[PDB]
Design a protein around this motif. Structure first.
Motif, short mmCIF file in Angstrom:
data_model
loop_
_atom_site.label_atom_id
_atom_site.label_comp_id
_atom_site.label_asym_id
_atom_site.label_seq_id
_atom_site.Cartn_x
_atom_site.Cartn_y
_atom_site.Cartn_z
N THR A 1 -5.95 8.48 -0.13
CA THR A 1 -6.23 7.65 -1.31
C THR A 1 -7.40 6.73 -1.07
OG1 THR A 1 -4.62 5.86 -0.75
CG2 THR A 1 -3.83 7.74 -2.08
N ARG A 2 -7.83 6.61 0.18
CA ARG A 2 -9.00 5.78 0.46
C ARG A 2 -10.28 6.45 -0.08
NH1 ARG A 2 -8.47 4.38 6.73
NH2 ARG A 2 -10.60 3.59 6.42
N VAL A 3 -10.19 7.73 -0.40
CA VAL A 3 -11.33 8.45 -0.99
C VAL A 3 -11.38 8.11 -2.49
CG1 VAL A 3 -12.36 10.70 -1.53
CG2 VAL A 3 -11.02 10.43 0.60
N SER A 4 -12.51 7.60 -2.97
CA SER A 4 -12.65 7.26 -4.38
C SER A 4 -12.46 8.53 -5.19
CB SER A 4 -14.02 6.65 -4.64
OG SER A 4 -14.18 6.26 -5.97
N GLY A 5 -11.59 8.47 -6.19
CA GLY A 5 -11.29 9.65 -6.99
C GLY A 5 -9.98 10.32 -6.57
N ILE A 6 -9.51 10.03 -5.35
CA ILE A 6 -8.23 10.59 -4.92
C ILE A 6 -7.21 9.46 -5.05
CG2 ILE A 6 -6.81 11.48 -3.01
CD1 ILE A 6 -9.21 12.90 -1.83
N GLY A 7 -6.32 9.61 -6.02
CA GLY A 7 -5.27 8.63 -6.22
C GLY A 7 -3.98 9.18 -5.63
N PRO A 8 -2.83 8.55 -5.91
CA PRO A 8 -1.53 9.00 -5.39
C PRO A 8 -1.16 10.45 -5.69
CG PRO A 8 -1.37 6.77 -6.24
CD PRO A 8 -2.69 7.34 -6.74
N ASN B 1 0.80 -1.21 0.00
CA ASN B 1 0.00 0.00 0.00
C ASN B 1 0.83 1.26 0.00
OD1 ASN B 1 -2.38 -1.34 -0.19
ND2 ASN B 1 -2.65 -1.55 2.04
N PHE B 2 1.91 1.26 0.77
CA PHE B 2 2.79 2.41 0.79
C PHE B 2 3.48 2.59 -0.57
CE2 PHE B 2 6.15 5.20 2.39
CZ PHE B 2 7.24 4.82 1.59
N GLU B 3 3.82 1.50 -1.26
CA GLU B 3 4.48 1.67 -2.56
C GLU B 3 3.49 2.25 -3.57
OE1 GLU B 3 7.55 1.42 -3.18
OE2 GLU B 3 8.30 0.39 -1.41
N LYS B 4 2.26 1.76 -3.50
CA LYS B 4 1.24 2.21 -4.43
C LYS B 4 0.88 3.67 -4.23
CE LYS B 4 -3.10 0.54 -4.09
NZ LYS B 4 -3.95 1.62 -3.54
N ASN B 5 0.56 4.01 -2.98
CA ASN B 5 0.07 5.35 -2.63
C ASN B 5 1.05 6.47 -2.37
OD1 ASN B 5 -2.44 4.05 -2.69
ND2 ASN B 5 -2.28 3.48 -0.53
N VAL B 6 2.22 6.15 -1.82
CA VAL B 6 3.22 7.14 -1.49
C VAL B 6 4.39 7.16 -2.48
CG1 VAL B 6 4.70 7.95 0.40
CG2 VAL B 6 2.46 6.89 0.90
N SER B 7 5.03 6.01 -2.69
CA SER B 7 6.16 5.95 -3.63
C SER B 7 5.73 6.04 -5.09
CB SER B 7 6.94 4.64 -3.44
OG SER B 7 7.49 4.55 -2.15
N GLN B 8 4.47 5.72 -5.36
CA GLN B 8 3.96 5.70 -6.72
C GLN B 8 4.78 4.71 -7.54
OE1 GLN B 8 2.80 10.49 -6.40
NE2 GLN B 8 3.20 9.58 -8.42
N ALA B 9 4.83 3.46 -7.05
CA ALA B 9 5.58 2.38 -7.69
C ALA B 9 4.60 1.21 -7.76
CB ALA B 9 6.80 2.02 -6.84
N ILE B 10 3.70 1.25 -8.73
CA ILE B 10 2.66 0.23 -8.87
C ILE B 10 3.21 -1.17 -9.06
CG2 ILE B 10 2.41 0.33 -11.41
CD1 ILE B 10 -0.41 0.01 -8.71
N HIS B 11 4.38 -1.30 -9.66
CA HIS B 11 4.91 -2.66 -9.86
C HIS B 11 5.49 -3.21 -8.57
CE1 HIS B 11 3.92 -2.15 -14.01
NE2 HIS B 11 4.76 -1.15 -14.17
#
Ligand SMILES: [Mg+2]
Ligand SMILES: [Mg+2]
Ligand code: NA
Ligand code: NA
Length: 331
Positions: free
Chosen positions: A97-104, A20-30
DNA sequence: CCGACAGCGCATCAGC
DNA sequence: GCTGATGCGCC
DNA sequence: GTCGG
């Protein structure tokens, strides 16, 4: 099917949090997916992992995660995760990011400007787009699960109103609901119509009229987005006299050309895990299955023309697989 | 070492 | 105005 | 972060 979470839950929860931290904060989806892959194989492992070396043997677990596992087994924690958790900026970005529509990106932008809580979002509603305002409005409800009994009542309404608009429509509720789950996260409705095929003129009205009827009977309460082929919105069951209102739920409605309909029902019924397994098998048999079609693979791996599909079973037949009942599609 | 890890609809941004 | 890119949500 | 060309 899965082993007790008691076995390796500490590890799987740690990996999921890192993901979750990589997805939301680091912006490293892989890296987010690498951690989810490791979490999943460990969750399926029917033994209590005693060292990182033992975990390393599993596909998806490499040197770094093995090292994290050793630190976790030796101390009961991970210094890096402990620090991340107490970091005001990372925690805040991750939460928004838990808000729908709010991404990283929006989460980062907000926190950068001092907007870190739902209260802050409220005081700054003009900095949110339509979708985000809706995700904020139903923050709690969108995180609630939907019991199957409510899903059945929701489906009764959808099927009733769709036929009322035009008795020739075909609609199918997919997702975990169709796989028979006892609860679902949202409702995904796939519709098609005899008059609409891939070689038919774009018909945004066929979708629109269904959406409008569901709004007329007060079932659909909000719209996140709506095009000619896909609607994303909010719905709510009518309240039972004196009883408390039902929470608002996410509902998607997709209009798909009849010749691509069953591949769509297959894809949106999932799960994602089962779909990956099915796509992998298809390739082995010389076929490629995506959301819209199933196509044969030529000598060099080039996908040819879409094959005729008149039911979900036709797809299984093409790949020489026995038809899997939706309830058997968790994997 | 280093590329793949899926890709598309809709809303909105960047820029001509 | 319009085109193309990006963010976001999705099996 | 992991896998595999
Ligand atoms: Mg009729
Ligand atoms: Mg779904
Ligand atoms: Na491994
Ligand atoms: Na979000």
């Amino acid at each position: 099917k899965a082993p007790q979470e008691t076995l390796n839950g500490g590890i799987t929860d740690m990996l999921t949090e890192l993901a979750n931290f990589e997805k939301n904060v680091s912006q490293a989806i892989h890296k987010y997916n690498a951690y989810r892959k490791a979490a999943s194989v460990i969750a399926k492992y029917p033994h209590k992992i005693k060292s990182g070396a033992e975990a390393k043997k599993l596909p998806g677990v490499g040197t770094k995660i093995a090292e994290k596992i050793d630190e976790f087994l030796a101390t009961g924690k991970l210094r890096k995760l402990e620090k991340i958790r107490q970091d005001d900026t990372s925690s805040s970005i991750n939460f928004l990011t838990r808000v729908s529509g709010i991404g990283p990106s929006a989460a980062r932008k907000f926190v950068d400007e001092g907007i870190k809580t739902l209260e802050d979002l409220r005081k700054n509603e003009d900095k949110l787009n339509h979708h985000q305002r809706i995700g904020l409005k139903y923050f709690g409800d969108f995180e609630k699960r939907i019991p199957r009994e409510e899903m059945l009542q929701m489906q009764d309404i959808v099927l009733n109103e769709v036929k009322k608009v035009d008795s020739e429509y075909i609609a199918t509720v997919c997702g975990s609901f169709r796989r028979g789950a006892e609860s679902s996260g949202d409702m995904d409705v796939l519709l098609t119509h005899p008059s609409f095929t891939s070689e038919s003129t774009k018909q945004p009205k066929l979708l629109h009229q269904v959406v409008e009827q569901l709004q007329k009977v007060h079932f659909i309460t909000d719209t996140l987005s709506k095009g000619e082929t896909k609607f994303m919105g909010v719905c709510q069951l009518p309240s039972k006299n004196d009883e408390k209102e039902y929470p608002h739920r996410r509902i998607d409605i997709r209009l798909i050309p009849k010749d691509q309909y069953y591949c769509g029902v297959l894809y949106f019924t999932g799960s994602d895990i089962f779909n990956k397994n099915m796509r992998a098998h298809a390739l082995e048999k010389g076929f490629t299955i995506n959301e819209y079609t199933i196509r044969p693979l030529g000598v060099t791996g080039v996908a040819g023309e879409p094959l005729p599909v008149d039911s979900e079973k036709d797809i299984f037949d093409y790949i020489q697989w026995k038809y899997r009942e939706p309830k058997d599609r968790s994997e």
